[PDB]
Structures are given as structure tokens and as C-alpha cells.
Design a protein around this ligand. Structure first.
Ligand SMILES: CCCn1cc(-c2ccc3c(c2)c(C)cn3CC2CCNCC2)c2sc(C(=O)NC3CCS(=O)(=O)CC3)cc2c1=O
Length: 101
């Protein structure tokens, strides 16, 4: 693991702690959420981010932050504000960006 992979693995562990039930652990498919692909063109989840750290695909912390922000933005676009999905995405987006700053 390079120094960048080490820092990103730390940030991912800290972010995943805020999601104990794994709401963000897997890719959201149309079978799971009807019409998802018609609303969300670039899906993102913690599992895909973990594979990118392991494959050394993040050249900077900025790229990792963009995937994290995309995952949360997708949840806040597809889900209504009264839902658990939206509230958790908004809470983790703020906490996550505060922590990595
Ligand atoms: C949080 C952002 C990501 N994320 C995640 C889920 C979701 C789906 C299945 C889930 C879970 C969570 C959990 C904890 C367990 N499972 C079982 C799976 C686990 C993996 N292997 C298959 C079984 C949903 S579900 C939904 C929806 O149904 N949204 C509607 C909500 C009401 S609305 O009016 O907003 C229309 C959209 C929107 C999302 C969504 O964005």
C-alpha cells in the first residue's frame, strides 16, 4: 500500500463507521430501486470505492472526495427529503467532508 492508499483506507474506514447497516455498501441497481438508472447516470457506493483504493486507482484525495460526494449526491437526488436514505446521505456527506478537511 502506497501512502495515498493508506490515507484513503483510513478515510473509508471512518466513513463506513457512520453506515453500520451498509445502506451505501453496494451498487444500487434497477432491480433494487426501480427507475434508478433513468435518474442516476453515475452510481457510486463504498464497495466500488474500496475496490478503487485496492487497485491504486485514486491519484489524489480530491478524486476520492469526488466519489464520496457523488455517492451522497445520488442518494439526495433519487430519494425524497423525508426518507431514511436522504437523511443518512446528508448527515454522512457533512460529517465526511468535515473529517477529510
Ligand atoms: C442510501 C443510498 C443508497 N440506497 C440504498 C438503498 C437500499 C437498498 C437495499 C437495501 C438497503 C438499502 C439495506 C440497508 C438493505 N438492503 C437490502 C439489499 C442489500 C444489498 N444486497 C441486496 C439486498 C435504497 S432503497 C431506495 C428506495 O427504495 N427509494 C425510494 C424511497 C421512497 S421515495 O419516494 O423517495 C422513492 C425512492 C433507495 C436506496 C438508495 O438510494
Amino acid at each position: 500500500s502506497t501512502p495515498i492508499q493508506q490515507l484513503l483506507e483510513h478515510f473509508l474506514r471512518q466513513l463506513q463507521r457512520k453506515d453500520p447497516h451498509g445502506f451505501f455498501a453496494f451498487p444500487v441497481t434497477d432491480a433494487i430501486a426501480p427507475g434508478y438508472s433513468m435518474i442516476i447516470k453515475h452510481p457510486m457506493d463504498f464497495g466500488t470505492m474500496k475496490d478503487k483504493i485496492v487497485a491504486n486507482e485514486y491519484k489524489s484525495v480530491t478524486e476520492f472526495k469526488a466519489d464520496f460526494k457523488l455517492m451522497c449526491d445520488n442518494a439526495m437526488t433519487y430519494n425524497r427529503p423525508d426518507t431514511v436514505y436522504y437523511k443518512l446521505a446528508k448527515k454522512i456527506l457533512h460529517a465526511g467532508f468535515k473529517m477529510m478537511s
